Amino acid sequence: RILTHFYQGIVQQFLVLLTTSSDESLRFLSFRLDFNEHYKARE
Amino acid sequence: LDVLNKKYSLLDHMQAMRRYLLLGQGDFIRHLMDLLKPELVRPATTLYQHNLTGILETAVRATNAQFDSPEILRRLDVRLLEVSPGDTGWDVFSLDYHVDGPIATVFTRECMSHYLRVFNFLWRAKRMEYILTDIRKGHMCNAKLLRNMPEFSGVLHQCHILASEMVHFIHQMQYYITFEVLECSWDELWNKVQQAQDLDHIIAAHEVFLDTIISRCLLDSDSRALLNQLRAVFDQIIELQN
Amino acid sequence: STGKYLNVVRECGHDVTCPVAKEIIYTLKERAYVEQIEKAFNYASKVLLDFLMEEKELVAHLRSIKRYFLMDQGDFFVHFMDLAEEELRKPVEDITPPRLEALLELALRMSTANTDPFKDDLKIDLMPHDLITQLELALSGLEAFSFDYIVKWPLSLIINRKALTRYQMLFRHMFYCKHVERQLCSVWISNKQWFAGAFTLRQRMLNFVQNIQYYMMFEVMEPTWHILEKNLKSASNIDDVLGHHTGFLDTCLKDCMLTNPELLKVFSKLMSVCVMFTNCMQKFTQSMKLLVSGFEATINKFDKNFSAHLLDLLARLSIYSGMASVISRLDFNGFYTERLERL
Amino acid sequence: REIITLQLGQCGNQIGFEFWKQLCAEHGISPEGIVEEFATDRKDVFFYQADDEHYIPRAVLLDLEPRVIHSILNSPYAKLYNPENIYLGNNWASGFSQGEKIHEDIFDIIDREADGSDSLEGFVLCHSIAGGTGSGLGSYLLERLNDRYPKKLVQTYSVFPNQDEDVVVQPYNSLLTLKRLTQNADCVVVLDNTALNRIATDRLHIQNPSFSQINQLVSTIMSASTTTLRYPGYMNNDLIGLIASLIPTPRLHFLMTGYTPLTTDKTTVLDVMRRLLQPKNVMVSTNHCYIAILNIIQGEVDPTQVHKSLQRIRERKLANFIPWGPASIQVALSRKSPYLPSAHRVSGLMMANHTSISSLFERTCRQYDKLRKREAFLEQFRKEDMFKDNFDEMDTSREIVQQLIDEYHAATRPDYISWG
Amino acid sequence: REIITLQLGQCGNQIGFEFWKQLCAEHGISPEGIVEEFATDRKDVFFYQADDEHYIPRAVLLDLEPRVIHSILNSPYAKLYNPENIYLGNNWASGFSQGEKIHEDIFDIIDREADGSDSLEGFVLCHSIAGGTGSGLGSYLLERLNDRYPKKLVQTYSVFPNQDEDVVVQPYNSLLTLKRLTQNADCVVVLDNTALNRIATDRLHIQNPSFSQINQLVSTIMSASTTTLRYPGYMNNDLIGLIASLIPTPRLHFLMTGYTPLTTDKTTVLDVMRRLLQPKNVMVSTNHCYIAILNIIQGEVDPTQVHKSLQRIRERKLANFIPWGPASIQVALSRKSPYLPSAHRVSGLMMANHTSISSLFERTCRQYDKLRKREAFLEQFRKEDMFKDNFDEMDTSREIVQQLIDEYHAATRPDYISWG
């Protein structure tokens, strides 16, 4: 259970930093990963 | 351009620099990484380069790399990392393509360094990926034996999708490196070599090719904090195996 | 101008040499230098306009200006409006530009507007101070919206800052009528009966905006387009093309309701009361499905304001200067032909 | 958005087949639907686009007692479509009951085609009034869609049956059909047999195969009304934007049409306008006044003449329309069509709401009321006997068409400021 | 590693023969297996490499009541293979018992082929559900391998029998077969007869030799799914790396497929993606949501469009999948194939776990339960009578497929956080 919560914690910590990186190259990774629309709806 | 491209085979070198180092080939690399596995699990202090060169040769002979020229397989040979008190072979390994003609005027040594850095990244990634598919391996062997004990169902049901949440993340990352890091730069590289009729334009194209690839991975100086998180995705992988 | 023309072809490749060289002298009574100057200048104009109209051609550029700013191909627009209006409905600093940029490529590449590679200069941008710029800040997607365009160097000589910004400012005025008419049709489908004066008000407003649009489509747009399509096929140099383009741009800017000494405040108050009517009626119907006595009073207020802005608009249009064409539509055996008799 | 076509009945499937052959020959495609290289267009509204660019039409085919549907089946245009939707008397109640029992699987065909579409704009149906098998069945499926979807539009192109009066229950059937048309549909485009008979006898000398040439004229009309959709325009490329101006009122939603050449085998904007002002160039036969008129022109037009023309059109007062309020003519331009010989260069199409069609309704009302006074003309067929034992739906339809004709005759008045 | 192919049954040996002819024509080799000089590739997974480069396939051939196996025997591709492994009712229990008595020497054939391999990755079998001779026998050998080797994978490509219902014990046989499939196999790829019937009737006009064209489409699919193996890629060149992402759970391991051209006789990444989003380009027929989708593309692609496309694919929300957790689509690229004409340049293949297939299982469950309520449809054949005197294996299979359908319907829910 702690491992699961840590995994959810580390992935949103990726995306919140990914929001301001680069205009084409790095931003696109955020849109590969979320196609399921509960990412950043747990925020 | 004629005498450099037929007498020293300069075009086949760049094609094989993308193939083996930059992972454009890959029965060869999967067979290398499969056959090199029990050595690299042990620390590299008890390993030397001749023990790599042999198994590399058998990797080359059995796979599709055999019907490629003996020169360019000969110019690629094994290398290691000089030792440190926490040596793993997965920490300590490299390939070296070294210069054997006038191609040093085309390929600088720091260009081989950036080559080896992105090689280090795409090594750590397919490293964790094979650990990941061994996790899925433990899943489809053990779960069909655990029908006969009903009480463990909840925790095994839980661990499966903690694993599947990782296996998807690697099934985005291996596919982000496929569609953006080795066709884009490769298309524009291929264009501005094969249309160009001056050596310096080919040189300046290969340079910015590898350099924008550096920015496109998280191997830049400013994206390093991004990199730092990504290393934390690799901890919970090996933790999960235990 | 003769030597000036040679640079702007030499800047984009091939400095071209003269077909024959003569030595020029002054001699008493003998103006043989004059015809040599005209022959060299004429060759300069010939090879320059022979450079422009094939490489970095102007024709597909004019077609792709008529396509979006003048609105020729708008299948793209009924793709775009329907799939983006709910995101456009949010005020400024609640929308983000990647969202609308992706929706723009959505509507472009779905659509039949796929015919030429100069559809990909198109980007969405805004005007921060919409009409004060002519001599919003709280809304965007309702009163701030534009299309962006990039240029090449031979097309930078004909079209520049001024032409592109007039294109943005005519597109904006055209955007107003596009939005109100689709609001009115969306209200029309809401009833496919008792209180029914709102149906008459809706019909009056929608017939009015169609009178305005087909007035503007067939008085300003296509006439000056075809006269431009005559002037550009008899041009002698690039200053001739420049004169024809500037006259065309002046005519399509002058001929609408973009040029007015007050910018026609009556027109703004009239589209305001139309938007207000659409909003409260859809609000009232959705609060009825889930009084027609107070609603009748509000419809009276809207009808009075609409009739007042209408009579101000006919009086201020009849004083202008072929301008009566919306009025020579509107009053056929006569309604809104005169309501308050003066004297 | 996207528009789904429907076709049923013998005349409806005939005119649908002619419409699809018209758009096959009109655009650059094969009779199996392969794009021609030599041809750009949007055909995404009435045809689903495939990977080899097979523009398979959005045409659901329903048949009952098939004879001509078999001839549609074996055709060189039977490779254009195959959506697998073909599923099997001359009375209104008969076709109503036959549609009633199979409403579920044809509704599955409807929902399958709806899932084929991403978005939707409207349903067109090919139907003929009092066509026998089409009549009653078409009213039933109109009821089914009007129950199911209040979010969409229905456009209907149907003819008025006049065979210059063996079938005597035809006014009853047409009356019940038009009752469902006024109350369950949003916009109706109606035509006459007699006006097309006049234009056909004028342009040509045929009398017996008149149906075939009628099909040609219907195809030209249906292409013309859709040209701003199929050729990319920039206004009223939704159906509802076209329909919105002509209909202020939910019962008077009947639209009459015209088209400038009678024979099609310069013309100026003045000439084609005044030709279009004639009722002999209109394909439907106190003073009557239009509520609103719409015109779309397609040809080689000069843009400066058109403002001259509508100036002088105001000046001569060659139209006489005054409903009560400021609703006038709307003139529009569409592309002159390539990929076909452009002879008879400029051609116009005309769309209005005019009160005179009520008189033609009244003619049918005069017939039906006469038969209703005698009450010997239902012939006691068992279908109408099951469906209504007391035959009170005919009286309800009579009171509805009475309301309709009274709304028409009040709509003529310049006191229609209220009850509009 | 190396993958050993298995084939049995009439439909399985048919599709295996078509697969080997497909890879014969696809790569540069002779029909006796001699390499062509004019041709580089790896064919070491499904073919053993010889000294004159005879790529003899890893195909073990088992036959029972051979008619078409004889036609496979005398062929110009009968010089490609000869591993000397050919060894001789329409019931599940019949094929089960016939495999039971010869399990030893066919296991000797298995172990001989295993010794032919140095390493191993997986076993594929060519099988058809309720195929008669294949049914029961295939479940038995699945039991034999699952008992013998827990170290390997099994991939299975098999069709769902629908002949639009003389054979009434077919739901029982398919039910018992799928019971062994859920519990003794790790990943299943299933297809429909009806969806291939739809695509075949759309792309062509054939009805009677439909099997042959079905074989062609199966061969194209089986080449496509293996292209990253046969043409050297650099990721998921093991089977388990491909399988790992799609299956989180050991009972819901059924994978459905799609392929972008229906007819194969530019396309952009946006076009082929949205085509692949259709169920009419998918060869298998509450809201249902995918768990995870995988796509592999092969063609002339531009690498910068693909990130644009998945941006806009997020933006339009043209897919609707939400299992409960962060498992999304995976897009990949493989080589556009040389040594054949590359027409219809870009083509995609699609692999997902979707819950909707449960409904199709439920349809079969509805049939079987109905027959189980009547209990007159085993026909009292002696084979099922010996193998189970009390017929309680059918009830055990019923409770297992009940658990499976309940796992499916819970897997739709966004509370599948537990029991996953």
Side-chain angles (χ1 to χ4, degrees), chain C residues 71-72 74-75 79 188 207 214 329 332 335, chain D residues 1 42 233-234 236 245 247 303 319 324 326 329:
Chain C
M71 256 236 311
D72 207 11
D75 213 82
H79 288 328
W188 192 95
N207 168 268
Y214 291 169
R329 257 168 84 165
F332 195 72
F335 196 81
Chain D
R1 294 303 319 129
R42 173 178 180 186
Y234 56 96
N236 320 315
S245 46
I247 295 156
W324 60 273
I329 200 177

PDB file of all heavy atoms in Angstrom, chain C residues 71-72 74-75 79 188 207 214 329 332 335, chain D residues 1 42 233-234 236 245 247 303 319 324 326 329:
ATOM      1  N   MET C  71     -12.810  34.886 -46.161  1.00  0.00           N
ATOM      2  CA  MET C  71     -13.662  33.703 -46.014  1.00  0.00           C
ATOM      3  C   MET C  71     -14.202  33.245 -47.365  1.00  0.00           C
ATOM      4  O   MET C  71     -15.240  33.707 -47.814  1.00  0.00           O
ATOM      5  CB  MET C  71     -14.791  33.940 -45.000  1.00  0.00           C
ATOM      6  CG  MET C  71     -14.594  33.276 -43.625  1.00  0.00           C
ATOM      7  SD  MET C  71     -15.980  32.221 -43.227  1.00  0.00           S
ATOM      8  CE  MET C  71     -17.333  33.379 -43.603  1.00  0.00           C
ATOM      9  N   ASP C  72     -13.373  32.508 -48.111  1.00  0.00           N
ATOM     10  CA  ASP C  72     -13.887  31.808 -49.287  1.00  0.00           C
ATOM     11  C   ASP C  72     -14.243  30.356 -48.984  1.00  0.00           C
ATOM     12  O   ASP C  72     -15.279  29.851 -49.429  1.00  0.00           O
ATOM     13  CB  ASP C  72     -12.883  31.849 -50.425  1.00  0.00           C
ATOM     14  CG  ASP C  72     -13.549  31.762 -51.775  1.00  0.00           C
ATOM     15  OD1 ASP C  72     -14.789  31.888 -51.831  1.00  0.00           O
ATOM     16  OD2 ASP C  72     -12.847  31.544 -52.780  1.00  0.00           O
ATOM     17  N   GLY C  74     -15.142  27.889 -46.155  1.00  0.00           N
ATOM     18  CA  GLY C  74     -15.546  27.937 -44.768  1.00  0.00           C
ATOM     19  C   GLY C  74     -16.148  26.647 -44.255  1.00  0.00           C
ATOM     20  O   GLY C  74     -16.699  26.645 -43.153  1.00  0.00           O
ATOM     21  N   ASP C  75     -16.087  25.560 -45.045  1.00  0.00           N
ATOM     22  CA  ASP C  75     -16.249  24.214 -44.485  1.00  0.00           C
ATOM     23  C   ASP C  75     -15.324  23.970 -43.308  1.00  0.00           C
ATOM     24  O   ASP C  75     -15.710  23.317 -42.327  1.00  0.00           O
ATOM     25  CB  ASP C  75     -15.979  23.146 -45.527  1.00  0.00           C
ATOM     26  CG  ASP C  75     -16.826  21.954 -45.316  1.00  0.00           C
ATOM     27  OD1 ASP C  75     -18.018  21.890 -45.728  1.00  0.00           O
ATOM     28  OD2 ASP C  75     -16.227  21.094 -44.643  1.00  0.00           O
ATOM     29  N   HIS C  79     -16.475  23.240 -39.441  1.00  0.00           N
ATOM     30  CA  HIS C  79     -15.754  22.299 -38.585  1.00  0.00           C
ATOM     31  C   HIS C  79     -15.287  22.992 -37.306  1.00  0.00           C
ATOM     32  O   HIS C  79     -15.544  22.520 -36.187  1.00  0.00           O
ATOM     33  CB  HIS C  79     -14.563  21.697 -39.340  1.00  0.00           C
ATOM     34  CG  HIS C  79     -14.951  20.715 -40.403  1.00  0.00           C
ATOM     35  ND1 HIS C  79     -16.065  19.915 -40.301  1.00  0.00           N
ATOM     36  CD2 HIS C  79     -14.369  20.398 -41.583  1.00  0.00           C
ATOM     37  CE1 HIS C  79     -16.161  19.151 -41.374  1.00  0.00           C
ATOM     38  NE2 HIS C  79     -15.143  19.425 -42.169  1.00  0.00           N
ATOM     39  N   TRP C 188     -33.252  28.651 -32.443  1.00  0.00           N
ATOM     40  CA  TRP C 188     -34.341  28.201 -33.317  1.00  0.00           C
ATOM     41  C   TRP C 188     -34.646  26.722 -33.123  1.00  0.00           C
ATOM     42  O   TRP C 188     -35.808  26.305 -33.183  1.00  0.00           O
ATOM     43  CB  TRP C 188     -34.005  28.457 -34.789  1.00  0.00           C
ATOM     44  CG  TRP C 188     -35.198  28.286 -35.727  1.00  0.00           C
ATOM     45  CD1 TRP C 188     -36.026  29.279 -36.174  1.00  0.00           C
ATOM     46  CD2 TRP C 188     -35.690  27.065 -36.321  1.00  0.00           C
ATOM     47  NE1 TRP C 188     -36.990  28.761 -37.002  1.00  0.00           N
ATOM     48  CE2 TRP C 188     -36.809  27.408 -37.109  1.00  0.00           C
ATOM     49  CE3 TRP C 188     -35.291  25.724 -36.267  1.00  0.00           C
ATOM     50  CZ2 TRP C 188     -37.533  26.461 -37.831  1.00  0.00           C
ATOM     51  CZ3 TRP C 188     -36.012  24.785 -36.981  1.00  0.00           C
ATOM     52  CH2 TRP C 188     -37.120  25.158 -37.753  1.00  0.00           C
ATOM     53  N   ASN C 207     -33.229  37.369 -39.754  1.00  0.00           N
ATOM     54  CA  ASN C 207     -33.376  37.934 -41.091  1.00  0.00           C
ATOM     55  C   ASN C 207     -32.536  39.195 -41.245  1.00  0.00           C
ATOM     56  O   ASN C 207     -31.969  39.441 -42.318  1.00  0.00           O
ATOM     57  CB  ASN C 207     -34.846  38.228 -41.387  1.00  0.00           C
ATOM     58  CG  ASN C 207     -35.028  39.070 -42.630  1.00  0.00           C
ATOM     59  OD1 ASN C 207     -35.085  40.290 -42.549  1.00  0.00           O
ATOM     60  ND2 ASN C 207     -35.121  38.421 -43.785  1.00  0.00           N
ATOM     61  N   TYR C 214     -25.320  39.052 -46.492  1.00  0.00           N
ATOM     62  CA  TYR C 214     -25.377  38.948 -47.949  1.00  0.00           C
ATOM     63  C   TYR C 214     -25.263  40.316 -48.605  1.00  0.00           C
ATOM     64  O   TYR C 214     -24.883  40.412 -49.779  1.00  0.00           O
ATOM     65  CB  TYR C 214     -26.662  38.264 -48.394  1.00  0.00           C
ATOM     66  CG  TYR C 214     -26.769  36.797 -48.074  1.00  0.00           C
ATOM     67  CD1 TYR C 214     -27.978  36.146 -48.224  1.00  0.00           C
ATOM     68  CD2 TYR C 214     -25.679  36.060 -47.623  1.00  0.00           C
ATOM     69  CE1 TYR C 214     -28.113  34.819 -47.940  1.00  0.00           C
ATOM     70  CE2 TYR C 214     -25.806  34.719 -47.332  1.00  0.00           C
ATOM     71  CZ  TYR C 214     -27.035  34.112 -47.500  1.00  0.00           C
ATOM     72  OH  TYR C 214     -27.232  32.791 -47.232  1.00  0.00           O
ATOM     73  N   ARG C 329     -33.524  45.826 -49.953  1.00  0.00           N
ATOM     74  CA  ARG C 329     -34.107  44.559 -49.539  1.00  0.00           C
ATOM     75  C   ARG C 329     -35.254  44.765 -48.559  1.00  0.00           C
ATOM     76  O   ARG C 329     -36.394  44.426 -48.883  1.00  0.00           O
ATOM     77  CB  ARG C 329     -33.017  43.707 -48.921  1.00  0.00           C
ATOM     78  CG  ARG C 329     -32.548  42.655 -49.855  1.00  0.00           C
ATOM     79  CD  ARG C 329     -31.288  42.019 -49.357  1.00  0.00           C
ATOM     80  NE  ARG C 329     -31.516  40.950 -48.386  1.00  0.00           N
ATOM     81  CZ  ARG C 329     -30.585  40.064 -48.035  1.00  0.00           C
ATOM     82  NH1 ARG C 329     -29.369  40.147 -48.551  1.00  0.00           N
ATOM     83  NH2 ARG C 329     -30.862  39.103 -47.164  1.00  0.00           N
ATOM     84  N   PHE C 332     -40.200  45.879 -48.418  1.00  0.00           N
ATOM     85  CA  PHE C 332     -40.506  45.520 -49.799  1.00  0.00           C
ATOM     86  C   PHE C 332     -41.827  46.118 -50.277  1.00  0.00           C
ATOM     87  O   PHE C 332     -41.854  46.814 -51.302  1.00  0.00           O
ATOM     88  CB  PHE C 332     -40.518  44.025 -49.990  1.00  0.00           C
ATOM     89  CG  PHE C 332     -40.471  43.663 -51.408  1.00  0.00           C
ATOM     90  CD1 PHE C 332     -39.286  43.845 -52.118  1.00  0.00           C
ATOM     91  CD2 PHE C 332     -41.599  43.281 -52.078  1.00  0.00           C
ATOM     92  CE1 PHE C 332     -39.217  43.563 -53.477  1.00  0.00           C
ATOM     93  CE2 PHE C 332     -41.541  43.053 -53.405  1.00  0.00           C
ATOM     94  CZ  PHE C 332     -40.346  43.175 -54.124  1.00  0.00           C
ATOM     95  N   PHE C 335     -41.982  47.567 -44.392  1.00  0.00           N
ATOM     96  CA  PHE C 335     -42.007  47.518 -42.935  1.00  0.00           C
ATOM     97  C   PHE C 335     -40.595  47.788 -42.445  1.00  0.00           C
ATOM     98  O   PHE C 335     -39.666  47.096 -42.871  1.00  0.00           O
ATOM     99  CB  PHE C 335     -42.511  46.179 -42.415  1.00  0.00           C
ATOM    100  CG  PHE C 335     -42.905  46.222 -40.972  1.00  0.00           C
ATOM    101  CD1 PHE C 335     -44.144  46.720 -40.597  1.00  0.00           C
ATOM    102  CD2 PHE C 335     -42.023  45.809 -39.986  1.00  0.00           C
ATOM    103  CE1 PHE C 335     -44.512  46.773 -39.265  1.00  0.00           C
ATOM    104  CE2 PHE C 335     -42.379  45.865 -38.649  1.00  0.00           C
ATOM    105  CZ  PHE C 335     -43.626  46.349 -38.288  1.00  0.00           C
TER     106      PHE C 335
ATOM    107  N   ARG D   1     -22.914  19.823 -39.961  1.00  0.00           N
ATOM    108  CA  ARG D   1     -22.084  18.653 -39.719  1.00  0.00           C
ATOM    109  C   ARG D   1     -22.219  17.617 -40.825  1.00  0.00           C
ATOM    110  O   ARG D   1     -22.024  17.919 -42.000  1.00  0.00           O
ATOM    111  CB  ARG D   1     -22.434  18.013 -38.371  1.00  0.00           C
ATOM    112  CG  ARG D   1     -22.125  18.859 -37.149  1.00  0.00           C
ATOM    113  CD  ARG D   1     -20.664  19.284 -37.071  1.00  0.00           C
ATOM    114  NE  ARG D   1     -19.717  18.234 -37.442  1.00  0.00           N
ATOM    115  CZ  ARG D   1     -18.738  18.402 -38.324  1.00  0.00           C
ATOM    116  NH1 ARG D   1     -18.582  19.575 -38.917  1.00  0.00           N
ATOM    117  NH2 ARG D   1     -17.920  17.400 -38.614  1.00  0.00           N
ATOM    118  N   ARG D  42     -15.151  18.444 -50.960  1.00  0.00           N
ATOM    119  CA  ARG D  42     -15.598  17.697 -49.789  1.00  0.00           C
ATOM    120  C   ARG D  42     -16.789  16.842 -50.187  1.00  0.00           C
ATOM    121  O   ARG D  42     -17.809  17.366 -50.644  1.00  0.00           O
ATOM    122  CB  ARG D  42     -16.004  18.599 -48.625  1.00  0.00           C
ATOM    123  CG  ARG D  42     -16.631  17.775 -47.495  1.00  0.00           C
ATOM    124  CD  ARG D  42     -17.021  18.571 -46.264  1.00  0.00           C
ATOM    125  NE  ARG D  42     -17.612  17.706 -45.239  1.00  0.00           N
ATOM    126  CZ  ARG D  42     -18.145  18.142 -44.103  1.00  0.00           C
ATOM    127  NH1 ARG D  42     -18.163  19.439 -43.837  1.00  0.00           N
ATOM    128  NH2 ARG D  42     -18.657  17.283 -43.233  1.00  0.00           N
ATOM    129  N   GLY D 233     -18.245  26.180 -49.667  1.00  0.00           N
ATOM    130  CA  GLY D 233     -18.576  27.577 -49.489  1.00  0.00           C
ATOM    131  C   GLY D 233     -18.114  28.063 -48.133  1.00  0.00           C
ATOM    132  O   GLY D 233     -17.326  27.398 -47.460  1.00  0.00           O
ATOM    133  N   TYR D 234     -18.632  29.215 -47.715  1.00  0.00           N
ATOM    134  CA  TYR D 234     -18.209  29.775 -46.440  1.00  0.00           C
ATOM    135  C   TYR D 234     -19.377  30.318 -45.630  1.00  0.00           C
ATOM    136  O   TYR D 234     -19.168  30.821 -44.523  1.00  0.00           O
ATOM    137  CB  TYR D 234     -17.161  30.867 -46.651  1.00  0.00           C
ATOM    138  CG  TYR D 234     -17.575  31.997 -47.565  1.00  0.00           C
ATOM    139  CD1 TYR D 234     -18.094  33.172 -47.040  1.00  0.00           C
ATOM    140  CD2 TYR D 234     -17.440  31.898 -48.947  1.00  0.00           C
ATOM    141  CE1 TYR D 234     -18.470  34.223 -47.873  1.00  0.00           C
ATOM    142  CE2 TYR D 234     -17.808  32.914 -49.765  1.00  0.00           C
ATOM    143  CZ  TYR D 234     -18.320  34.072 -49.230  1.00  0.00           C
ATOM    144  OH  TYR D 234     -18.682  35.088 -50.068  1.00  0.00           O
ATOM    145  N   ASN D 236     -23.680  29.330 -44.534  1.00  0.00           N
ATOM    146  CA  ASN D 236     -24.769  28.354 -44.476  1.00  0.00           C
ATOM    147  C   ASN D 236     -24.310  26.979 -44.951  1.00  0.00           C
ATOM    148  O   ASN D 236     -24.996  26.303 -45.723  1.00  0.00           O
ATOM    149  CB  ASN D 236     -25.995  28.819 -45.267  1.00  0.00           C
ATOM    150  CG  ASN D 236     -26.263  30.299 -45.106  1.00  0.00           C
ATOM    151  OD1 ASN D 236     -26.215  30.841 -43.999  1.00  0.00           O
ATOM    152  ND2 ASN D 236     -26.563  30.958 -46.210  1.00  0.00           N
ATOM    153  N   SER D 245     -33.826  31.196 -41.868  1.00  0.00           N
ATOM    154  CA  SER D 245     -34.405  32.459 -42.302  1.00  0.00           C
ATOM    155  C   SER D 245     -35.784  32.272 -42.915  1.00  0.00           C
ATOM    156  O   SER D 245     -36.615  33.186 -42.871  1.00  0.00           O
ATOM    157  CB  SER D 245     -33.477  33.141 -43.297  1.00  0.00           C
ATOM    158  OG  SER D 245     -33.013  32.216 -44.264  1.00  0.00           O
ATOM    159  N   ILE D 247     -38.250  30.064 -42.251  1.00  0.00           N
ATOM    160  CA  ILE D 247     -39.328  29.528 -41.420  1.00  0.00           C
ATOM    161  C   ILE D 247     -39.351  30.258 -40.102  1.00  0.00           C
ATOM    162  O   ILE D 247     -38.445  30.089 -39.266  1.00  0.00           O
ATOM    163  CB  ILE D 247     -39.170  28.009 -41.227  1.00  0.00           C
ATOM    164  CG1 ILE D 247     -39.346  27.311 -42.574  1.00  0.00           C
ATOM    165  CG2 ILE D 247     -40.174  27.490 -40.216  1.00  0.00           C
ATOM    166  CD1 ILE D 247     -38.681  25.985 -42.664  1.00  0.00           C
ATOM    167  N   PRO D 303     -19.521  40.533 -60.492  1.00  0.00           N
ATOM    168  CA  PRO D 303     -19.966  40.877 -59.135  1.00  0.00           C
ATOM    169  C   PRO D 303     -20.552  42.266 -58.996  1.00  0.00           C
ATOM    170  O   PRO D 303     -21.176  42.551 -57.971  1.00  0.00           O
ATOM    171  CB  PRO D 303     -18.679  40.755 -58.336  1.00  0.00           C
ATOM    172  CG  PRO D 303     -17.599  40.990 -59.299  1.00  0.00           C
ATOM    173  CD  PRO D 303     -18.051  40.535 -60.634  1.00  0.00           C
ATOM    174  N   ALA D 319     -41.656  41.806 -57.684  1.00  0.00           N
ATOM    175  CA  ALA D 319     -42.187  40.846 -56.733  1.00  0.00           C
ATOM    176  C   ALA D 319     -43.223  41.573 -55.895  1.00  0.00           C
ATOM    177  O   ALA D 319     -43.196  42.801 -55.788  1.00  0.00           O
ATOM    178  CB  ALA D 319     -41.084  40.244 -55.860  1.00  0.00           C
ATOM    179  N   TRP D 324     -45.815  40.855 -42.922  1.00  0.00           N
ATOM    180  CA  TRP D 324     -46.152  42.054 -42.168  1.00  0.00           C
ATOM    181  C   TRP D 324     -44.880  42.790 -41.789  1.00  0.00           C
ATOM    182  O   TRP D 324     -44.937  43.910 -41.275  1.00  0.00           O
ATOM    183  CB  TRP D 324     -46.937  41.723 -40.899  1.00  0.00           C
ATOM    184  CG  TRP D 324     -46.193  40.831 -39.972  1.00  0.00           C
ATOM    185  CD1 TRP D 324     -46.176  39.473 -39.992  1.00  0.00           C
ATOM    186  CD2 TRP D 324     -45.345  41.228 -38.888  1.00  0.00           C
ATOM    187  NE1 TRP D 324     -45.381  38.991 -38.984  1.00  0.00           N
ATOM    188  CE2 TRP D 324     -44.854  40.052 -38.295  1.00  0.00           C
ATOM    189  CE3 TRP D 324     -44.946  42.463 -38.366  1.00  0.00           C
ATOM    190  CZ2 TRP D 324     -43.993  40.074 -37.200  1.00  0.00           C
ATOM    191  CZ3 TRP D 324     -44.097  42.481 -37.281  1.00  0.00           C
ATOM    192  CH2 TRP D 324     -43.626  41.293 -36.711  1.00  0.00           C
ATOM    193  N   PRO D 326     -40.134  42.762 -41.801  1.00  0.00           N
ATOM    194  CA  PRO D 326     -39.016  43.121 -42.683  1.00  0.00           C
ATOM    195  C   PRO D 326     -38.232  41.954 -43.273  1.00  0.00           C
ATOM    196  O   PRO D 326     -37.003  42.010 -43.343  1.00  0.00           O
ATOM    197  CB  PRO D 326     -38.122  43.952 -41.757  1.00  0.00           C
ATOM    198  CG  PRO D 326     -38.359  43.367 -40.407  1.00  0.00           C
ATOM    199  CD  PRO D 326     -39.790  42.908 -40.376  1.00  0.00           C
ATOM    200  N   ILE D 329     -35.771  39.086 -49.714  1.00  0.00           N
ATOM    201  CA  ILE D 329     -35.035  38.091 -50.483  1.00  0.00           C
ATOM    202  C   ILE D 329     -33.583  38.022 -50.017  1.00  0.00           C
ATOM    203  O   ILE D 329     -33.012  39.007 -49.524  1.00  0.00           O
ATOM    204  CB  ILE D 329     -35.148  38.391 -51.991  1.00  0.00           C
ATOM    205  CG1 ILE D 329     -34.832  37.139 -52.810  1.00  0.00           C
ATOM    206  CG2 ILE D 329     -34.274  39.568 -52.416  1.00  0.00           C
ATOM    207  CD1 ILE D 329     -34.991  37.313 -54.290  1.00  0.00           C
TER     208      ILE D 329
END
